[PDB]
Amino acid sequence: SNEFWTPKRLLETDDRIFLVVGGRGVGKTFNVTGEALDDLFFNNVSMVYLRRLGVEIDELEKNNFITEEMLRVYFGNRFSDFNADESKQIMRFSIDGAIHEIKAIRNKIFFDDRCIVYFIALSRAGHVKSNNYPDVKYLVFDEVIIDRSIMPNARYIRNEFTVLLNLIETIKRKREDFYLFMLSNVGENFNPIFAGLGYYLTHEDIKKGFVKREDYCVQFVENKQEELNMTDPFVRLGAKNRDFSNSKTNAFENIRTPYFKHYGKKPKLLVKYDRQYLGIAERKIPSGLEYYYQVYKTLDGLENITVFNNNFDTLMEDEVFLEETQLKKKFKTYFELFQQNMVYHESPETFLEWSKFVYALKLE
Amino acid sequence: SNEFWTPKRLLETDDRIFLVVGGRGVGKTFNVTGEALDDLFFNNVSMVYLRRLGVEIDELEKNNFITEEMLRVYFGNRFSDFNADESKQIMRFSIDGAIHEIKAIRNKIFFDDRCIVYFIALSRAGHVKSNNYPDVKYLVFDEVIIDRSIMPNARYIRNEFTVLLNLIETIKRKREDFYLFMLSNVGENFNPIFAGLGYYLTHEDIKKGFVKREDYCVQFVENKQEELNMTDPFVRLGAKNRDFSNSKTNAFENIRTPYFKHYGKKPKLLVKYDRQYLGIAERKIPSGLEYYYQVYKTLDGLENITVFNNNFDTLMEDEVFLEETQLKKKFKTYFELFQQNMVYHESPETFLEWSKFVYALKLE
Amino acid sequence: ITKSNEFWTPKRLLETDDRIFLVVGGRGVGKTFNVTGEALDDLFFNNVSMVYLRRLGVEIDELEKNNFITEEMLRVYFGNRFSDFNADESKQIMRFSIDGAIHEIKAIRNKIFFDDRCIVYFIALSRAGHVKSNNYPDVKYLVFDEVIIDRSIMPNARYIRNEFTVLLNLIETIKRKREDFYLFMLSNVGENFNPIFAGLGYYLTHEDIKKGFVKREDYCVQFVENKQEELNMTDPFVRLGAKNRDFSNSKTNAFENIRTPYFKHYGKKPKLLVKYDRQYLGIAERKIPSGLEYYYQVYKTLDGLENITVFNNNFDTLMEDEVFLEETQLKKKFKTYFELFQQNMVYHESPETFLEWSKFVYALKLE
Amino acid sequence: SNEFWTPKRLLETDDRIFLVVGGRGVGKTFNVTGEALDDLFFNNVSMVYLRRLGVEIDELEKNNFITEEMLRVYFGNRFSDFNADESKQIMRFSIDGAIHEIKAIRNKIFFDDRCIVYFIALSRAGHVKSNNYPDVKYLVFDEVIIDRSIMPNARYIRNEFTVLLNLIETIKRKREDFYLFMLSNVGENFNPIFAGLGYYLTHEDIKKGFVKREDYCVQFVENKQEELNMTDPFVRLGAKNRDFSNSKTNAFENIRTPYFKHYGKKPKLLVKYDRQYLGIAERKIPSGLEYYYQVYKTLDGLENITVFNNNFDTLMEDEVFLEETQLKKKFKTYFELFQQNMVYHESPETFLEWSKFVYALKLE
Amino acid sequence: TKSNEFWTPKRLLETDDRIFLVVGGRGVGKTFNVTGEALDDLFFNNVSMVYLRRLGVEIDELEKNNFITEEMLRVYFGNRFSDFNADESKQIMRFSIDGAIHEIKAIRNKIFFDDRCIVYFIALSRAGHVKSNNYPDVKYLVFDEVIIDRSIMPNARYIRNEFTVLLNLIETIKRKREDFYLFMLSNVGENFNPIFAGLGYYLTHEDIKKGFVKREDYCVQFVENKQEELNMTDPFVRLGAKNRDFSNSKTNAFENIRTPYFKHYGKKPKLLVKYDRQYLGIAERKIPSGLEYYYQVYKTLDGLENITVFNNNFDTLMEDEVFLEETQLKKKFKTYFELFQQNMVYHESPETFLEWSKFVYALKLE
């Protein structure tokens, strides 16, 4: 729970959006909260612990989010005179000789009667748009990428990245000093979070520990068994199970790398999205078909190809309206062919544009 | 600073029924509740927060309905000595030197041990027809128009507007001083609320902020194209995603405007409704048929055309009784052809009469 | 909002010597309100209790109990006598003064108490089978509200299987050798083809409605008609409602359609017989080119109908050649006939026989 | 005032398991509790009121289980000074000049702060496995037999009689002074309770009031003497309804009497159960088949007939293991043919053997 | 009959092993006595316990106020225990130990001792949702009814990849701790389950006749209810004796252990899957009646050059091996897994049987 990773190396740089992939995950969330204690206690700022699904918060132990050892390791000699009423979910401790009290109730934690941690779930985000979060400096999004191994039939929230963005706007209103931590235990492409960030995961970027971008940073953290305690029976038992053993280093086991190929012929359909036109080209082969997902900056040269439009406002003239029932009829297989890695992309740059488009309109 | 829109301009006018469409939506509900606090506290009146579906009430946290920050902007200097016991679901504070207590338990909110807000759902209203709500001056109907995007499956209540009217009568019993607020974050036609009000949504009425009527007022609020701080990473991140950006202006993205056309031939069938006769005319074309939805003031000229009657009491011996099985046999397809915009209406005036009728008798 | 005629009161019914009252029509809030109000005096000071009965348990759970007895209620039925009212709504406690004595009304766990004495029980007809051994010591008032299903409000709401027999069992349990007992059945709509009317043996007819009151040996029936003569057209809510016919029709929809059956006599003998209530009910089918037309008949004795099949609901009374009407044999041979009854598709000999058939159908009907 | 049935005639005999069939049901539980009050109050013993389903206990009014007018008939002039707070579920009264208090909370009743009645449901027996019942002398099982007329679709607990035995063992731990009252409003065969007791209901035993067996007694009671008053409108209303009226005496309307016939031919299959052999023989008739359910104590004479075994542990040699799916494949129809009275049994003695076997393995 | 409290983990806590699998018995006594022997530590050594059940349904319906009972306190503290009084309204037990007053209250699926959490009630089916949860001082982890008894509930499935889920939970509860004990209690013992496969334990009647089986990583103890002579003068005892089902139910723990069939087949396999530094193979032998299947294990690919090889793991994927994604396995392994759970196939030996168990329960779907 006190791993070698710390967010100090990230807080010192000038960036404010961090994507941390890899690690125990149990240690990551623990150390992020600990490094934030000082600000939360004495700088009049709060924290928001965000999970995707409300079920993930109800089962979360709040009383144990801030724990005795958490304070001992992050305050040391400053800390003494600790007593707590776990039944009533209260802590009584002293820092620098001053007496403080932390109470945990419902989805909030208070420090001297000031909320310092909010527990809210993205699937319930529509409820929390009420701006009761005046001074939130840290937003922590934990387990932000689904591990298909852990939970095969798990779905992201509909239009998740827009929901998340709406929530940031609500939590952070005209605040310069705001930080967002996106903690993931596994790294892979083909998910709305990566697409929203516009990040394409590549082993070259993983071999390098750090990746800097205009709007955010990405940090990859390595786990290594190093020395194993083969005197402990529980440790020995785990070594005998391959599946459990691999789970320790399963972060980058399979990054989802698409296939890339170019096709000269013109596309069969076009859809206008983000002041561009996405295109799908089909090439007939004896076995069946080959799909090419393309991007065109202008309609010059592809005069009489049909153009679908998601938005009614940007609709015009010869474009056909993209209603939700007409879209399910025409794009379901194309989305399936995409989510399953069955198509050729022009380049990683086009792949991200298609990812944004797919995850915006995908239906569930 | 403070939100541009205010309900003061509406409370000053002589109308008592307000339909506010567009915006973030919480700011609407947030600001309406705040302006009412004064009456709720000192003039012995209560409030009712109405949602369509019981699910919309259960997931709502009643403690965040009235919040400190809300009390801050709506009382300024009169409010101080605020203390809150989240453990007991209590808020304590001092106003004008008087100490008050706000408690939320059993889906109710109290002020000095007097209920000031009731949370009840329209889908359960038929059972509580005998239930009473002694001193309610404000009725707030939130999210009164379904945003099909936000929710996968959401249905209006069968005969919703009549259920709503029935609830109004129960809540408001011979009170000359009563107010009704209907808040919508998205505006579109083909819904029972607009049909009940007899309002036809048009882009022309949106360019104008306000629309006065005899029985109610409609005010449209659009988000204000604020300057974006592109130095902020979060703002740049949002700018790179069009779905999130488009969501800011999706309130009036697509109002459902039907098609209008006249047909000289006589109708196939007639139904007597509201001292008038609604008619459907079918015109044969090579491709198939095209439908015309008409209204006739009198039977002059239409002698032997069949006439359906919803009401047994007003029935005549040559009219056919419109029982729940006979209308499924004959009018179900016409209702689908209506809900989907595949028919021609004589005019918006007749469209609203057909809308009222459809939403009155249509089934699921 | 405003309906232009006086509200209903049980004063005219308590004056007569009868004890079973069926009140049909009205808004409904005023009825239950005034029934409770007229009973408060007894409930408070004569050591008797009340039972508010609903068909479905959800109708009771969804009920707001603390608002059942309200400030303005005690004010109209005690007037000057009432004073010093203050209440802690959060704790569901009413404290008030009557004739200078301080009383306290508390509502907890689906009960209402007056000075620490239960005066109202909220019990649901659908849970009555579980309350066999329950004890209700001093109950003088039993109120059965919304006793007739309104097909408009509730699309596919169903009566309880053998409902009227369930209700009688509840009356006996609540009423244990008590001369002084009252039962109020209140309905917002009046129509035939329901177990309550069938159990009472009452046949609703417009003839009976023009007349306000009906006196029967075991009960009285009173009809109340809303009169929307004068309207406050200054109020927008009134105008908003007036422009919507559906809401407007709903105000007077109580007697919109009483379910009036068809009556016809057919001389030929029946296709089957069933022994019920010391009689023989018969169904006769007459062939017509379009199909068939059904006649539901009543026979006092088998003279003339020797070899016609006879179903018997009761195993004990079963004799010789009669066929026992067990629940699977009844589904095969009476499901369609019961459907034919509930839908108004058959000819009855007379209103007298129709009620005899109603008792039978709702007694054995299945769901 | 005095109810006519009493358990005194049963407590004086040397037996300890009593099955009382018939009556209102209200008087039975009322009178059993009354005869037990003395022991419950002054001999430091408790009672357990058992119902099949938790639904039957939650809806039960506990405070009214012991009532004032019950204390008067079973204590008379000694009972006095009665005062009760129904709101707080307290009864305070005097017996022999001593002040006592009865308090009812949740699902327990106390006498002078000593639990005298436990209300527990057979469907929750797994929850009470922890033995908190030191001094329980009375166990009362009410409405122990399903009345198919009152409740058509009501089910017994899976392997109910074994569950009951497990509960008896938990409540009674080697205690010798223990009494069990099984009270039923209906008498009929083909139920797990009768099968467990090994009692076969016969009109011959009903004409006789009492029946005495090694492990239990059965007493059949007809309904109280008092003839109904026709001065009361409610009585006439009930008198005019056939179903309600017969329902008063429907206890022995249809005891399910099986058919008995002997068949000389040997069985088609055998199943070993309880060191016995149950067999089913099929006799061909032109119309179809005739089934004979027989019992064989030894395989002498039926050498090469198959033998199914429910239990793997007792399995030997040529017997075939009876998995739960293979038995549903082969014994399901035979069980259906049994529960419906479609088969011939050698005798009532063998009928009970099949009842035990069927109800032991019968499935939902 | 009484509790049957003969069984205790005291003789087990003295041995050096820390993982105990106790199978068979009344079921109440197992959980009852484990909790009782641990009470002393829970009250006075500032450590807590975690009561683990497979399905959330088993905990919600569970009554927490009965977990620690009056009898338990007296039996594991004796005359050292006194002045017991309880408040049913609040469900608070107040008792005295050594003259000291303590109070046990249970709220929010937790039990507290002097306002300190001593027992957590958490369900394995929800453990995946909160991997990051903290449980500060847990010394005991008790997994009750860890083997599904098809009798207790007709329809019930093990969790997908359960043993990996459990280990992750073990790791979460036990951080920075060497003194930790894990109790797995089962009321029925049978093969073909993920817990046994994870432990690598193969149940055999030889191991049952002996009460105890010491293994390197865990201990297994089999408990048999003690034959208390029946009082055949008591009517209730006779009534129970006449119901074979009630009587047999007491000794039903090891009624049918699922023993697989073992046979060797000389031909080469049809398919191979690389798992745990080895190669699992399936060979089909044609017989007149139909087919008979052989589940094999090969230490090396020497000799089976052009046979197909599936690989669950992408990182180690090579050359001609085909990726075993969750949809590709349904097309080719669904029937073989069904044929495995039903004992319709031949295994080389119990050692290989467990390797297939690990593999099947790791990739099996529900």
Q: Which residue of D has its CA nearest to C202?
A: D237
A163 and chain B in contact, CB less than 8 A: no
**Contacts A55 to E, Cβ<8 Å:** 126, 129
C102 in reach of chain B (CB within 8 A): no
Q: Beta partners for C118?
A: C113
Q: Determine whether the interchain pair C63/B131 forms a contact, defined as Cβ–Cβ distance below 8 Å.
A: yes
**How far apart (Å, rounded) are the C-alpha atoms in residues D69 and B182?**
57
- Interface-testing mutation among A63, A185, A229, A244, with chain E (most E C-beta atoms within 10 A): A244
Chain position carrying tokens 């039975």: D28
Cα-Cα end-to-end distance for chain A: 37
User: Residue B340 has which token pair?
Assistant: 């989907």
Q: Neighbouring chains of D at 3+ CB pairs within 8 Å?
A: C, E
Closest CA–CA distance from residue E292 to any residue of chain A (Å): 29
Q: Are E76 and E65 in contact (CB under 8 A)?
A: no
The DSSP code for B67 is: -
**Spatial separation of the C-alpha atoms in residues E357 and C254, rounded to whole Å:** 69
8 Å CB contact of C20 and D233: yes
> Which chains have 3+ CB pairs within 8 A of E?
A, D
Instruction: List CB contacts (< 8 A) between D60 and chain C.
Output: 130-131, 133-134
Asked how this structure was determined, the answer is X-ray
Beta pairing, strands D210-212 & D217-220: antiparallel
Cβ distance D127 to E61 less than 8 Å, yes or no, reads yes
- Residue among A63, A86, A243 whose CB faces E164 most closely: A243
CA angle centred on C124, ends C123 and C129, rounded to 5°: 100
What 3-state class would DSSP assign to D5? coil
**CB of D223 within 8 A of CB of D185?**
no
Q: Which of B170, B174, B360 sits opposite C29 (nearest CB)?
A: B170
B213–C contact, CB cutoff 8 A = no
How many contiguous H segments (helices) and E segments (strands) does chain B have?
A: 12, 18
Task: Give me the residues of E, 170-189, that contact A with CB < 8 A.
Answer: 170-172, 174-176, 178, 180, 182
Please, which chains are in contact with A (at least 3 CB pairs closer than 8 A)?
A: B, E
Cβ–Cβ under 8 Å, residues A102 and A110:
yes
Distance to chain A for B237, nearest Cα, Å? 7
Inter-chain residue contact C20 with D65, CB threshold 8 Å:
no
Q: Which two tokens stand for residue C192?
A: 């035939």
Burial of residue D207, with CB atoms counted within 10 A of its CB: 0-12 exposed, 13-18 middle, 19 or more buried: exposed
Q: Is the dihedral of CA B320, B322, B328, B333 positive or negative?
A: positive
Q: Which of D86, D148, D246 sits opposite C116 (nearest CB)?
A: D86
Show residues of chain B in contact with A131, CB under 8 Å: 26, 69
Contact B87/A at CB under 8 A: yes
E56/A contact by beta carbon, under 8 A: no
Three-point CA angle B21, B24, B30, nearest 5°: 90
Among B87, B240, B242, select the one facing A198 at the smallest CB separation: B240
| 3-state SS, one letter per residue, for chain E | CCCCCCCCCHHHHHCCCCEEEEECCCCHHHHHHHHHHHHHHHHHCCCEEEEEECCHHHHHCCCHHHCCCHHHHHHHHHHHEEEEEEECCCCEEEEEECCEEEEEEEECCEEEECCCEEEEEEEHHHHHHHCCCCCCCEEEEEECCCCCCCCCCCCCCCCCCHHHHHHHHHHHHCCCCCCCEEEEEECCCCCCCHHHHHHCCCCCHHHHHCCEEECCCCEEEECCCCCCCCCCCCHHHHHHHCCHHHHHHCCCCCCCCCCCEECCCCCCCCEEEECCCCEEEEEEEEECCEEEEEEEEECCCCCCCCCEEEECCCCCCCCCCEECCHHHHHHHHHHHHHHHHCCCCEECCHHHHHHHHHHHHHHCCC
Q: A188 CA to chain E: closest CA distance, Å?
A: 13
User: How far, in Å, CA of D334 to CA of C189, rounded?
Assistant: 51
Neighbour-count burial of E194, counting CB atoms closer than 10 A to its CB (0-12 exposed, 13-18 middle, 19+ buried): buried
Do the beta carbons of residue A268 and residue A307 sit within 8 Å? no
User: What is the C-alpha to C-alpha distance for residues D306 and D270, in angstroms, rounded to an integer?
Assistant: 6
The residues that bridge with A47 in the sheet, in sequence order, are A117, A138
- The region that residue B7 occupies, defined by phi over 0 for left and psi between -120 and 50 for alpha, beta otherwise, is alpha
Which tokens in the block code for residue C64? Answer: 């707001």
Give the side-chain half-sphere CA count within 13 A for D264.
0
- Write the CA distances from C302 to C279, C296, C359, integer angstroms: 9, 16, 21
C169 → chain D, closest CA residue: D244
* Alpha-carbon dihedral sign for residues E72, E75, E76, E79: positive
D313 touches chain E (CB under 8 A): yes
**Helices and strands (H and E) in chain C: how many:** 11, 18
From D126, which residue of chain E is nearest by alpha-carbon distance?
E62
Supply the DSSP string of B258-300, one letter for each residue: PEE----SPPSEEEEETTEEEEEEEEEETTEEEEEEEEESS-T
Chain E residues in contact with A61 (beta carbon < 8 A) = 130, 133-135
Which of A133, A85, A86, A83 has its CA nearest to residue A107?
Answer: A133
Q: What share of chain A is helix, strand, coil (3-state, %, to 5)?
A: 30, 25, 45
Sign of CA dihedral E336, E340, E344, E347: positive
Contact between A86 and E358 using a beta-carbon 8 Å cutoff: no
Do B363 and C88 make contact, defined as CB atoms within 8 angstroms? no
**Among positive and negative, which fits the CA dihedral C164, C169, C170, C171?**
positive
Chain B: residue nearest A132 by CA? B69
Token output for A353? 């544009």
What is the token pair recorded at A129?
A: 């748009």
Work out the minimum CA distance from E124 to partner chain A, whole angstroms.
Answer: 12
* Residues paired with C22 in a beta bridge: C185, C221
Residues with Cβ within 8 Å of residue C234, at least 6 apart in sequence: none
Of all residues in chain E, the one with the smallest CA distance to D163 is: E246
CA of D249 vs chain E CAs: smallest distance (Å): 31
Please indicate whether, in this complex, the C-beta atoms of C183 and D87 are within 8 angstroms of each other. no
Interatomic CA distance for residues A32 and A74, integer angstroms: 11
Strands C93-98 and C82-88: antiparallel
Among residues B333, B289, B280, the alpha carbon closest in space to that of B307 is found at: B280
Torsion of CA B64, B66, B69, B73, to 10 degrees: 150
Contacts of A269 (CB under 8 A, 6+ apart): A279, A280, A305, A306, A308, A330
Query: Per the structure block, which two tokens stand in for D81?
Result: 């000074």
Touch test C–D: 3 Cβ pairs or more under 8 Å: yes
Minimum-distance CB partner of B134 among C71, C235, C249: C71
Place of tokens 């037996």: D15
Is A87's Cβ below 8 Å from some Cβ in E? yes
E314 touches chain A (CB under 8 A): yes
Nearby residues of C301 by Cβ (< 8 Å), 6 or more positions away: C280
Phi/psi at E11 (nearest 5 deg)?
Answer: -65, -20
3-state secondary structure A244-279: HHHHCCCCCCCCCCCEECCCCCCCCEEEECCCCEEE
Would you say A270 and A302 are in contact if contact means Cβ atoms under 8 Å apart? Answer: yes
**Inter-chain CB proximity D246 and C314 less than 8 Å:** yes
| Partners of residue C152 in chain B, C-beta under 8 Å | 159
E244 touches A at CB < 8 Å: no
Q: Are chains E and C touching, using the cut-off of 8 Å on CB pairs and a minimum of 3 such pairs?
A: no
Which residue shows structure tokens 């995409």? A338
Closest CA to E220 of E179, E250, E254: E254
Is B148 in Cβ contact with A196 (below 8 Å)?
no
Closest CA to C24 of C6, C41, C8, C40: C8
**Domains of chain C by range and CATH?**
11-251 (3.40.50.300), 262-364 (no CATH)
Q: Is the CB of residue C32 less than 8 Å away from at least one CB of chain B?
A: yes
Q: CB distance from B237 to chain A under 8 Å?
A: yes
Strand E261-262 to E346-347 pairing: parallel
Are the C-beta atoms of residues C36 and C50 closer than 8 Å to each other? yes
Residues of chain A contacting residue E132, judged by C-beta atoms under 8 Å apart: 25-26, 29-30, 60, 142-143
Give the C-alpha separation, B223 to B23, whole Å.
6
Please state whether beta strands C139-144 and B179-184 pair in parallel, antiparallel, or not at all (unpaired): unpaired
Cα first-last separation, chain B: 44
Please report the sign of the dihedral spanned by the C-alpha atoms of residue B243, residue B245, residue B246, residue B251.
positive
Q: Which residue of E66, E244, E249 is in closest CB contact with D130?
A: E66
Contacts of A128 in chain B (CB under 8 A): 64
* Chain D positions in Cβ-Cβ contact with residue C217 (cut-off 8 Å): 233, 236
Task: Check if the beta carbon of residue C47 is closer than 8 Å to that of residue C23.
Answer: no
- For the packed helices A348-361 and A324-339, what is the interaxial angle rounded to 10 degrees? 140
Q: Using DSSP, how many helices (H) and how many strands (E) does chain A show?
A: 11, 18
User: Closest Cα to residue A189, out of A260, A259, A258, A256?
Assistant: A256
Of E116, E175, E180, the CB nearest to A1: E175
**Is the Cβ–Cβ distance between E130 and E28 less than 8 Å?**
no
Chain D contact for C16 (CB, 8 A cutoff): no
